[PDB]
Every structure is written in structure tokens, then in C-alpha cells.
Scaffold this active site. Structure first.
Site, PDB file in Angstrom:
ATOM      1  N   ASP B 290       0.793  -1.221   0.000  1.00 17.13           N
ATOM      2  CA  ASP B 290       0.000   0.000   0.000  1.00 17.13           C
ATOM      3  C   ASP B 290       0.826   1.273   0.000  1.00 17.13           C
ATOM      4  O   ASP B 290       0.479   2.252  -0.664  1.00 17.13           O
ATOM      5  CB  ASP B 290      -0.970  -0.003   1.170  1.00 17.13           C
ATOM      6  CG  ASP B 290      -2.084  -0.996   0.976  1.00 17.13           C
ATOM      7  OD1 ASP B 290      -1.996  -2.115   1.513  1.00 17.13           O
ATOM      8  OD2 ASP B 290      -3.034  -0.653   0.253  1.00 17.13           O
ATOM      9  N   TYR B 294       1.021   1.856  -3.978  1.00 16.47           N
ATOM     10  CA  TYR B 294      -0.121   2.750  -4.109  1.00 16.47           C
ATOM     11  C   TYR B 294       0.043   4.163  -3.566  1.00 16.47           C
ATOM     12  O   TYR B 294      -0.668   5.072  -3.992  1.00 16.47           O
ATOM     13  CB  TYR B 294      -1.342   2.126  -3.434  1.00 16.47           C
ATOM     14  CG  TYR B 294      -1.776   0.780  -3.979  1.00 16.47           C
ATOM     15  CD1 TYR B 294      -2.218  -0.226  -3.126  1.00 16.47           C
ATOM     16  CD2 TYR B 294      -1.826   0.541  -5.354  1.00 16.47           C
ATOM     17  CE1 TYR B 294      -2.712  -1.442  -3.631  1.00 16.47           C
ATOM     18  CE2 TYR B 294      -2.315  -0.664  -5.866  1.00 16.47           C
ATOM     19  CZ  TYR B 294      -2.758  -1.648  -5.003  1.00 16.47           C
ATOM     20  OH  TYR B 294      -3.265  -2.817  -5.520  1.00 16.47           O
ATOM     21  N   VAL B 296      -0.020   5.397   0.130  1.00 17.20           N
ATOM     22  CA  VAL B 296      -1.111   5.599   1.095  1.00 17.20           C
ATOM     23  C   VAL B 296      -1.494   7.044   1.399  1.00 17.20           C
ATOM     24  O   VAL B 296      -2.672   7.346   1.604  1.00 17.20           O
ATOM     25  CB  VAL B 296      -0.865   4.869   2.473  1.00 17.20           C
ATOM     26  CG1 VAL B 296      -0.680   3.390   2.279  1.00 17.20           C
ATOM     27  CG2 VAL B 296       0.319   5.472   3.204  1.00 17.20           C
ATOM     28  N   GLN B 298      -1.658   9.539  -0.498  1.00 18.35           N
ATOM     29  CA  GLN B 298      -2.471  10.046  -1.587  1.00 18.35           C
ATOM     30  C   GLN B 298      -3.959   9.805  -1.353  1.00 18.35           C
ATOM     31  O   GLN B 298      -4.798  10.632  -1.712  1.00 18.35           O
ATOM     32  CB  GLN B 298      -1.993   9.356  -2.866  1.00 18.35           C
ATOM     33  CG  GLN B 298      -2.897   9.390  -4.052  1.00 18.35           C
ATOM     34  CD  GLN B 298      -2.209   8.861  -5.291  1.00 18.35           C
ATOM     35  OE1 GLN B 298      -1.459   7.882  -5.246  1.00 18.35           O
ATOM     36  NE2 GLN B 298      -2.436   9.520  -6.398  1.00 18.35           N
ATOM     37  N   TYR B 299      -4.279   8.708  -0.685  1.00 17.76           N
ATOM     38  CA  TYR B 299      -5.674   8.356  -0.436  1.00 17.76           C
ATOM     39  C   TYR B 299      -6.220   8.680   0.961  1.00 17.76           C
ATOM     40  O   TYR B 299      -7.252   8.149   1.357  1.00 17.76           O
ATOM     41  CB  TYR B 299      -5.876   6.885  -0.807  1.00 17.76           C
ATOM     42  CG  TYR B 299      -5.480   6.615  -2.246  1.00 17.76           C
ATOM     43  CD1 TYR B 299      -6.162   7.232  -3.300  1.00 17.76           C
ATOM     44  CD2 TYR B 299      -4.381   5.812  -2.558  1.00 17.76           C
ATOM     45  CE1 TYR B 299      -5.752   7.061  -4.631  1.00 17.76           C
ATOM     46  CE2 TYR B 299      -3.962   5.628  -3.888  1.00 17.76           C
ATOM     47  CZ  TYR B 299      -4.658   6.259  -4.916  1.00 17.76           C
ATOM     48  OH  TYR B 299      -4.274   6.100  -6.227  1.00 17.76           O
ATOM     49  N   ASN B 373     -11.029  -1.866  -0.777  1.00 20.38           N
ATOM     50  CA  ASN B 373     -11.881  -2.324   0.318  1.00 20.38           C
ATOM     51  C   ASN B 373     -11.321  -2.035   1.726  1.00 20.38           C
ATOM     52  O   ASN B 373     -12.088  -2.020   2.701  1.00 20.38           O
ATOM     53  CB  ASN B 373     -12.132  -3.827   0.177  1.00 20.38           C
ATOM     54  CG  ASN B 373     -10.853  -4.630   0.106  1.00 20.38           C
ATOM     55  OD1 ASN B 373     -10.099  -4.540  -0.859  1.00 20.38           O
ATOM     56  ND2 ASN B 373     -10.585  -5.410   1.140  1.00 20.38           N
ATOM     57  N   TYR B 374     -10.016  -1.766   1.822  1.00 23.91           N
ATOM     58  CA  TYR B 374      -9.353  -1.528   3.115  1.00 23.91           C
ATOM     59  C   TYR B 374      -9.278  -0.084   3.527  1.00 23.91           C
ATOM     60  O   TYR B 374      -9.184   0.819   2.693  1.00 23.91           O
ATOM     61  CB  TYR B 374      -7.876  -1.987   2.946  1.00 23.91           C
ATOM     62  N   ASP B 375      -9.365   0.133   4.835  1.00 23.34           N
ATOM     63  CA  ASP B 375      -9.261   1.465   5.421  1.00 23.34           C
ATOM     64  C   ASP B 375      -8.309   1.305   6.605  1.00 23.34           C
ATOM     65  O   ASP B 375      -8.509   0.437   7.455  1.00 23.34           O
ATOM     66  CB  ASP B 375     -10.620   1.994   5.888  1.00 23.34           C
ATOM     67  CG  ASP B 375     -11.631   2.072   4.758  1.00 23.34           C
ATOM     68  OD1 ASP B 375     -12.016   1.003   4.272  1.00 23.34           O
ATOM     69  OD2 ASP B 375     -12.039   3.181   4.355  1.00 23.34           O
ATOM     70  N   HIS B 584      -4.468 -12.090   9.745  1.00 19.92           N
ATOM     71  CA  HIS B 584      -5.921 -12.108   9.718  1.00 19.92           C
ATOM     72  C   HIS B 584      -6.582 -13.338   9.111  1.00 19.92           C
ATOM     73  O   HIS B 584      -6.440 -13.614   7.915  1.00 19.92           O
ATOM     74  CB  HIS B 584      -6.378 -10.847   8.972  1.00 19.92           C
ATOM     75  CG  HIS B 584      -7.832 -10.501   9.125  1.00 19.92           C
ATOM     76  ND1 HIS B 584      -8.403  -9.427   8.467  1.00 19.92           N
ATOM     77  CD2 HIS B 584      -8.813 -11.028   9.899  1.00 19.92           C
ATOM     78  CE1 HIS B 584      -9.667  -9.303   8.836  1.00 19.92           C
ATOM     79  NE2 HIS B 584      -9.939 -10.262   9.706  1.00 19.92           N
TER      80      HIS B 584
HETATM   81 CU   LIG Z   1      -7.276  -8.106   7.153  1.00 13.54          CU
END
Ligand SMILES: [Cu+2]
Ligand SMILES: [Cu+2]
Lengths: 620, 620
Positions: B290, B294, B296, B298-299, B373-375, B584
Site C-alpha cells: 500500500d 499505491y 497511502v 495520496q488516499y 476495500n481496506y481502510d 488475519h
Molecule cells: Cu485483514
């Protein structure tokens, strides 16, 4: 009303009467422990019999007794004389605390030791410490208290800043005699004061802290009924209080739509030991079972609003018995409030355009106790998402010694010539499980790494494995942080909508367990502390991991003994005992008064619910 | 003003102007990354020189470039053309994300796959994910994104509830070509919706939560100066923001009396990887960095007052570059506030009669980001007692798949036919240490158990041992929870009043590290994640544990290459890189939207101060 209601001043007075009318509570008798017994196993135990258990000491030197009385029927159910040399001595009486100093003050050997160090006996404070069980055969059967000296320069002076090393005494608190005085040699008594209230030490106080106001304009979200029955955000439980264990939580359940689903029948800190790792003869016998020997509940502080508990607080003032059977209230001894807990759930979805954020909350139930130099806060938390957590906060003043010339491998220096012996604070949480009812089972879950090859050609696969603990002989487990080891308590007869047994997963902090050599007296007396998790079959008389009478008890009692029964724990009424603690190598920053440090554990739902249980929390 | 101030809109526009003037930013160029560089190691130096580093992509397929410009001087310091097949592709451009679904919509292999599933292409969302490096030779040198499909039934529907298993496509986002469409077979597409806003699923919302009001009648206790310089309860620091790393903390120092003592020169989350553990060819390539791939920062979300950040909040709105070099502000992207933190220190002394209680509090600096989908929430905490802590909070919607009929060893079931592949979220905190200055060293501290015998007759003694890490070759360390392993960063030339080197101790959570097989692509690309702690000698071009260009980049850069230099780290300018993460195994409670889970680490002073640094905290 509820058979789990807190003990009343009146019930305590009634116990006193019953013991009296029964001829058990005479003028030479002392109450060393008194507490209400939990209702017996019976789904709808209608006939309520409010029973209390008492440990009665005798100042004359007569054998003590364990008595159970029925406050409901004003009777004595049982009275048993105890052979302390066999079953252990009764908990230390608060009144026996001064005795050590008093006796020593007129002892020639003691006075001689103080004179060699030029210390005014009137200035010497003596800490009344538990003795444990060592090579002194003459102590078996006698209730001994060992004493370590600290100089108090004036009434408001902190004596801990001035330990008197090279000196220790043993005192028989019943025959009232100093059995021994050991002086291994003079050590300089640290001179600096540790008076954290002295402007000279604190310097000018900060004027930089602006206030943080926490209020609830509409009152709290929890309701208290029947004196101690809490209802909060789907949670339901009863807050009990015992002089030995302190705050005890009963009937922790969650209202999942239509059903009030049980999770934990009884949760408590059933033991707390503080073993010292200094090999000096002056302290090598040092191990305080704050819960077992001293009874942390009786020393609970009366909390103050704004200082100890901030926000909209609801207090409980538990009632205990004094040494004579008279009820004593611990005003504002338990704090109950809910506090904001940041973000609960959040997702900003590109595709749906829905931006969602919800805040978390935790119900808090706590008390703070003081045992000599230590002060510990015991906190239980219930979260919106079903998580249950316990946290112990350790503060106070570190137990001091002289810092050896030439340094030490077992003591750290806090100030010039001032040492702080290494030690641990190890707790035992006794969790009488009731995951959707009493038919439970425990599985040890380890992360499983997989080797790259057929069926995993990219070598990215990883899994997990679960081993059911079927018998008590295979239920003494250790941590393995490396493989992410956790323990799941499930109900094999209760499945969620995906047809998997409902469960809760225990996440430990994986701190070091008891460090003492396995053959040591402390390893034997606090055997529970040598492993992270124990699982036993429930039994009404298996209450503490160290047994009923810890004080000067030989060893092997409690858990090692219970486990020996090797009962079936696969789908039975079981109890989880989790050992967790802090290993303290005191730092300069811990002096003169230590900042809070913490340890704990938590349990999170694991397939207990059919989906997130917090979809109904509003935006707000 | 301060060289650590946040980049201004003007600075970004100026970098654009400078690149344009230099002929480096024509119409086919796009800014894949732009960030300000930290001042060089040279206290103050020869005045201000604000330098910016930029990664420039070319949409026509020309080679990209890495450029450094001096916005102060209006010059290009350096500009080098990159050979991406060797050194890595540039970070994914936000504009390239939509390209995947767009191209696939008219691809006949894709359409045939969807038709085989009776899915309307207009309703099929495609998650555009990083590609990684595998066996597809044709991908070397090309910018590839892989796509996994999810059905969205209507505009506000959560597509994650409807994964389309057995199908994956690879897309060249520059030449705009679908390189591969792999269909391994049809799997039922889970039918239940996961709309956490639908009253049909949430049920009536709770009306039981009363408000919790947190206010500061006199404003906060911290001051913000120069836009981002914070001063709070003896702490001093600068809050920076980078599009790749997000919130970066600079010059963390503590004012001890009259001296401002440095502790950490720079703190950031330099990388984070999310590896998946499902060996299905549909997802076995799935790993996102991320931070590195990506970006992070930036988002980062715009944080709403009241729900995201509760209390008296001071916001920062960092400015970043868009794809064309124009400045873009992330309104209220960073929250700053102080929170009450329970009891700081407490002791009720019998002997002195003094009852003392002090309250704790922490300064909080945070931001929240959303990627697909992740935050993730990134929180930095500074406590009154000198403790520094970081906490990552993982929430959002879990990444789904079909749940195999016969169950799975690598996927868990969330709803009927709905699976959640196992994965981890692993972070790398890069701590450029400055304990009382730059001359630092690191020691690994282990608890040492002692055998009962000569000099430890009672078998109660326990100690600790410290091993200095002298060269980079011996500075790659692993956790050892069982022995209470920690790492102390000290300054061998700065001693406290007790003549011991001042220090800070790093306490890790000891969670499992990277689980993938050591011979896997991800183990090599995310080598840093395979060990808990790395220590390197500072170098201005050693910023990320994975190197400058992570996207589709094999092993060869990052920590393993830096460490090989085997530089002296015993009393030198050093950097600590700590790996910590969550493993997880999704639970039913994580669906349809997951409650926050956390992970982090903290550093506590270890003989840094001469006594407790909070003796001057007032009573209230
Ligand atoms: Cu997870
Ligand atoms: Cu301690």
C-alpha cells in the site's frame, strides 16, 4: 433480590451474630477473611441460601477454623478446625502489620544492628512481609512475618528512599517474639529523599495543562439495577466484590437479538504474585501473593471524582468485615462508566459512494488497591463489538535496597547508592467459561506455515491448526508468540448460522512467565505462574490457583493438584486460568514514584455471532 | 521558515514550472510521485534549499525519470531515465485504476467468462490490483494491473459481497491491452448483500447510546507554530506529510529542564505489505504494498469532526501534486488533539500519610486512508512520561472469494458461499534515531533465567543480558517473546546522573512476521517483513525497506542490499526498521464491515532521564 447482589452491612452483622450465637466468634477470635459464596450450580436455583465463608483466627494461639454460615437460615453449615502446618496459615491480618516494627523496637539484636548504622530506632519503619516457606523448620505451624527496615526522616518522609540493607528479621506474630535477626553487614543507607511532593524535587509545577472536560449531558448509557446488575449496549452482568479477589464479574452475557447469550459465568483475578529475583539472603525469600496472602480487596482505595475516575461515574461502595465481624464500607471503591473508544468501523467505498464511520465505546469497571509500596488498578472492559478485556496498571513506589558497590546482575540503580531488586508481578485470571452455556471446550490455535511445492507452487499459502484439549493432563499450555498461538473456547453443541460451533478467542500478551528456577520454593508455591494457560473441569471448591491458604503453604497446592485429577474437559463445565505478568527491571524513570505500566489480555468473539454485532450502532 | 514545514501549493506549482521549463514535463508526462526531501545532514547548513523528488511517468511508453529539483533555486539537481525492468516500475497512477474494468468490458475472453456466469458486464466491478512479479516474462518492463471481479447489483450495492471466483485478468495499462484472461471454472457468486446501511440488515438502530461530550474550555495544551511545529508537555516535533509515507514525524525532542534533548530524528511507516495466503491461482499472486505501490498518503480521507476525530481537534490539510503537477489539498487530512489517558502515577503511603494521584494524557497525530476495500488509520502518540507509540487500525470490508464447497485450509466462511482468504497486514516503521544526538547504538536485551545453586541457593534469581549490535551484518534480529526480548537504543557518549548511557527501549507486540515460504516471490520482494528488527547506518538514499520502486520489482533493492554494506553501527548515525503486523483469519464478525483491529509498538525511556520526568505534573 438477585442471589448475586453485593453483601449487605446487615448480612455481615448477621454472620457476626450467627458466629456469636453459635459460640464461634469469641473475644480472642479474629475474622481473617469473610465473603459471600456464589449460588450453587442449578439452572433455576429457586431456594436462595445466602451463605458466607469465614476464616477465623485465634490470637490465643488456638487452631484457626473455616466456617460456612447461612445468613438466610441463621445457621452454621460447617465449622472445621485447621491444621495450618498441613493446609497453610490464614491471610495476614491488617492488625499484624504494626506488630513487626513494635516487637523489633525492643529487641537487643535489632537495636544493636541499628546502633551499628547510627539509626534512631524511632525513625525506623519496618515492612511486615510474608515469609513463605524456606529452610526454617521451626516456622512450620507458626505464623511468621519477616521484616525489612526503611528510614523515615520525618512524618511525611518517604521511607522507601532509605532502605537499610544487610539486615532482616523474622517475627512470630502470635507468640509475639523475634525468632531471628540477621545482619550480613552494614550497607550505606541511601541519603537522597524521594519526596515527590517536595517543591525542591518536583521543581515548579506545570502551568501548561489545559482542562479536558468529559461529560454526559443525558447521563450514562448503562443502567444499574438490584444494586450491582449492569445492562449496557447488549451486555448484561453482575458486579460482585470479594475481599480477597476484589471486583468479580458474574453472568457476563450478550443480548443477541432475542436471546441473552452467556459468555463467561465468572471472571476474576484469582491470584497475584510478586516474586523477587535478588539472590541476597536479605531478600531471596521475598515473594508477595498480594491476593492470596494479603487480600487485595480489603485494601481498595476510596476513589475520588475527577482524579481517579473522570467523566460521568457511577460508584459502588462494597461492604466488608473488620477483624471482629463488624461491616465496613469502602466508600467509592468501584468505578463504573463508559468511555469513548475511537473508531469502531469505517469504510469509504468508491463503487457504492457510501462513506461510513462508527465510533467505539467500552464499559469500564475498576478499583485501585494499595499493598505497602505497590498500588494496582484492576480494569475490566466490555466493548461494543463483543470484546472482553482486562488490564492491570501497576504503580506505587518501587521496593528498594542498597545498590551494591561494583554493580549487580539482579538489582538496578535508581539514585546514588539506591537499588531496586528485579521482580515480576504475575496475575492469574480465572475465567469460569459459559460460551452459550456450560458445555464448553478449549482448542489451542497455531498459525501453520506451508512449504512451497505441489498445491502451493507460489509458496504464498499459510493456514492455522486447532488442537482440542480433551483431558486436564493435556491442558497446561505455554505461549508461542512466533506462531501466533491463541486459545479458543467454544460450545460444540451451539452452532452459528454457518454451522460452526460458537466461540471466543483469548489473545494473550505473551509476556515472560515465572523466571525462578523450577526447583525453587516459589516455583512450587506459585506453579500456576510457570505456564500461560490452564484448563480445569469446574468444581465448587477449586477457587484459587494457589489454593485456599497461601500464607506459608508448602507448595504444589491449587492448580497442580486440581489438574492431577485429569478430568474430561471436552464439552464440559470448564474453567480457564490465564497467567500473565510484568517482568520489572526498575529504571531511573520509576523513581521516586513510578509511572503506570500495564499488562492484560482480551477475548474476542470467534464465530459467536452470525455477522458483526454492531451493524445497529447509529451514526450519532 | 523551518525547513521542515509542509509543502505549500505554491511549492508544488513551482516544481511543475521548473520541470516544464526544463523540458521534463510535456503533455505526455504524469507525476507518479512528488515529495519534499528532508534537509541534508548539516545542522542549519548554508541557508534554505527546499528540494523535491519526483517520479515522472510517460503515457506514450517512453522511459520514466527520477528527478530532484531545488524549488528555492529554480533548478533541476538531477534527472535520470529509468530502466523499469531492472529497477522497478513507478507507483500505480490513480488514473490507471479505472482502465482495467474499461478495457475488460469489451474483451471477448472476459465477456465469455461473464456470460458463462450469467452476469451483466455493466454490473461487474473490477478491483485493479498490483501485479507483483511472477512467471509471465512478457510483463517485464510493462505496467501491468491484475483484475478480480465483484458484482454490484445496484448503484449503492456493496460489490464485495458478490465475488466472482475462478476468474482473473491481467491488463497492460499503458498500451491498453488485456494480456491474459484466466477462467479456472465457474463458482457460485454469493447472493446475500453486505449493505451495512440497509435497515433490512442492521435492524432498527439502537436508541440506547447517550452522548459522551469531550471538550476543552480553554483550548488545547499544545501549540502549533510555523504551520506544523508542535509543542506539547515538554515535547517538540514537526508533523510532515508525504504522499507515499503519509504522516511523518520530524525532530521528536523532549525539553528536560533547560535542554531540548533529541530522541527520534524521523519516524514513519516506510512500507506496509498485505500478502494473501490462498494458493488458488486466482489469488496466489495477490500482495499489495500500500505504501510503496499505491502511496497511502495520496488516499487519506478528509476527517469529519465529531465522528472521525472527537474533542478539540486541530487539523492540518496537506497539499500533494495531482497527476499533472497541480497542487491538491487533502482538507482536514490530519487530526491533532490531546486525550486524557487515565492514571499516570498513584500511591497512598501508610507511613507518610500522603495520598498521591496524577492523571496521564497523550498527544495524538493521526490520519486515515482508504485503498479499495481496506481502510487504515495511522496513529502516533506522545505520552507525558516520555513514551512514544504508534498504532495502526485496520478496518473496511474484507477482500472476498467464493467459499469452496468442501471447506478450505486457507479461506474462512463469512456468509453462505462467501469466503475470505487468509492474509496479513505487515508494517515497517523506519525510526531514524537521535537519542540525545546522532551517536547511537542498539543492544538486544533478553531476560536471563538462572540455575539454582552456588550464589543462587534459593533459585529465585533472574537477570538480563544486553548484546550490542556492532555491524549491519549482525543487526537483523527476530523476536523472542518467551525471553522478554526488547531492543534498547542508547547514546554511548551521553550518560545520565548515574553514569549510565541514556536510552529508549523498543517494546514490540511480537506478532507473527511474514508467513510465506522463504523461496516465494513475496518473501524476496518483502524481505524486510521476514524479520522483526533491522538496524542500518544512515544514508540519504536508504529510505524504504523495499527500495524506491516497488511496483513489479523483484528482489535486489531495499534492506537486504543496504545491510550487505556491513557498516559500523556502534555509536553512529543509525536507523531502526521495525516490522510488525496482523495475521488475519477473517471471522464471521468481520462481515459485512469489519470492526477495527490494531497493532503497533512503543518506545519507553530507559535511563534517559535522571528521575521520573513527570514530577512536575500538578494535582488536578
Ligand atoms: Cu485483514
Ligand atoms: Cu514492579
Amino acid at each position: 433480590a438477585s442471589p448475586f447482589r453485593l453483601a449487605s452491612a446487615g448480612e455481615i452483622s448477621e454472620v457476626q451474630g450467627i458466629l456469636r450465637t453459635a459460640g464461634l466468634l469469641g473475644p480472642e477470635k479474629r475474622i481473617a477473611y469473610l465473603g459471600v459464596l456464589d449460588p450453587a450450580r442449578g439452572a433455576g436455583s429457586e431456594a436462595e441460601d445466602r451463605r458466607f465463608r469465614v476464616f477465623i483466627h485465634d490470637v490465643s494461639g488456638a487452631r484457626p477454623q473455616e466456617v460456612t454460615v447461612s445468613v438466610t437460615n441463621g445457621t452454621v453449615i460447617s465449622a472445621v478446625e485447621l491444621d495450618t502446618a498441613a493446609t497453610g496459615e490464614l491471610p495476614v491480618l491488617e492488625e499484624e502489620f504494626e506488630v513487626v516494627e513494635q516487637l523489633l523496637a525492643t529487641d537487643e539484636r535489632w537495636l544493636k544492628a541499628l546502633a551499628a548504622r547510627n539509626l534512631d530506632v524511632s525513625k525506623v519503619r519496618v515492612a511486615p512481609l510474608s515469609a513463605g516457606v524456606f529452610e526454617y523448620a521451626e516456622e512450620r505451624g507458626r505464623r511468621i512475618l519477616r521484616g525489612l527496615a526503611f528510614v523515615q526522616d520525618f512524618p511525611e518522609d518517604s521511607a522507601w528512599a532509605h532502605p537499610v540493607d544487610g539486615l532482616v528479621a523474622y517475627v512470630d506474630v502470635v507468640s509475639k517474639e523475634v525468632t531471628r535477626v540477621i545482619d550480613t553487614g552494614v550497607f550505606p543507607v541511601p541519603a537522597e529523599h524521594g519526596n515527590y511532593t517536595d517543591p525542591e524535587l518536583t521543581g515548579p509545577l506545570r502551568t501548561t495543562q489545559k482542562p479536558i472536560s468529559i461529560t454526559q449531558p443525558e447521563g450514562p448509557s448503562f443502567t444499574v439495577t438490584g444494586g450491582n446488575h449492569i445492562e449496557w449496549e447488549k451486555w448484561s452482568l453482575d458486579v460482585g466484590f470479594d475481599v480477597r479477589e476484589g471486583v468479580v464479574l458474574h453472568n457476563i452475557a450478550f443480548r443477541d437479538g432475542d436471546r441473552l447469550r452467556p459468555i463467561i459465568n465468572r471472571a476474576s483475578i484469582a491470584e497475584m504474585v510478586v516474586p523477587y529475583g535478588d539472590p541476597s539472603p536479605i531478600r531471596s525469600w521475598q515473594n508477595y501473593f498480594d491476593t492470596g496472602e494479603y487480600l487485595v480487596g480489603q485494601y481498595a482505595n476510596s476513589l475520588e471524582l475527577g482524579c481517579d475516575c473522570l467523566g460521568d461515574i457511577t460508584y459502588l461502595s462494597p461492604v466488608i468485615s473488620d477483624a471482629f465481624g463488624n461491616p465496613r464500607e469502602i466508600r467509592n471503591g468501584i468505578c463504573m462508566h463508559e468511555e469513548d473508544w475511537g473508531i469502531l468501523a469505517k469504510h469509504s467505498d468508491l463503487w457504492s459512494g457510501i462513506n461510513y464511520t462508527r465510533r467505539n465505546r467500552r464499559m469500564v469497571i475498576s478499583f485501585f488497591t494499595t499493598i505497602g509500596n505497590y498500588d494496582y488498578g484492576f480494569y475490566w472492559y466490555l466493548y461494543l463489538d463483543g470484546t472482553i478485556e482486562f488490564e492491570a496498571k501497576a504503580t506505587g513506589v518501587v521496593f528498594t535496597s542498597a545498590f551494591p558497590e561494583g554493580g549487580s546482575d539482579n538489582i538496578s540503580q535508581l539514585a546514588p547508592g539506591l537499588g531496586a531488586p528485579f521482580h515480576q508481578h504475575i496475575f492469574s485470571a480465572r475465567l469460569d467459561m459459559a460460551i452459550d452455556g456450560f458445555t464448553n471446550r478449549v482448542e489451542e490455535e497455531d498459525v501453520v506455515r506451508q512449504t512451497m511445492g505441489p498445491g502451493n507452487e507460489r509458496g504464498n499459502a499459510f493456514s492455522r491448526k486447532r488442537t482440542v484439549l480433551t483431558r486436564e493432563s493435556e491442558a497446561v499450555r505455554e505461549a508461542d508468540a512466533r506462531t501466533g498461538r491463541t486459545w479458543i473456547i467454544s460450545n460444540p453443541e451451539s452452532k452459528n448460522r454457518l454451522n460452526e460451533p460458537v466461540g471466543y478467542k483469548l489473545h494473550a500478551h505473551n509476556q515472560p512467565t515465572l523466571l525462578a528456577d523450577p526447583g525453587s520454593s516459589i516455583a512450587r508455591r506459585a506453579a500456576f505462574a510457570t505456564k500461560d494457560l490452564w484448563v480445569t473441569r469446574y468444581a465448587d471448591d477449586e477457587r484459587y490457583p494457589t489454593g485456599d491458604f497461601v500464607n506459608q503453604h508448602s507448595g504444589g497446592a491449587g492448580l497442580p493438584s486440581y489438574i492431577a485429577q485429569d478430568r474430561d474437559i471436552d464439552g464440559q463445565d470448564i474453567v480457564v486460568w490465564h497467567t500473565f505478568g510484568l517482568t520489572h527491571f526498575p529504571r531511573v524513570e520509576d523513581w521516586p514514584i513510578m509511572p503506570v505500566d500495564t499488562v492484560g489480555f482480551k477475548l474476542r468473539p470467534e464465530g459467536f455471532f452470525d455477522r458483526s454485532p454492531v451493524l445497529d450502532v447509529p451514526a450519532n
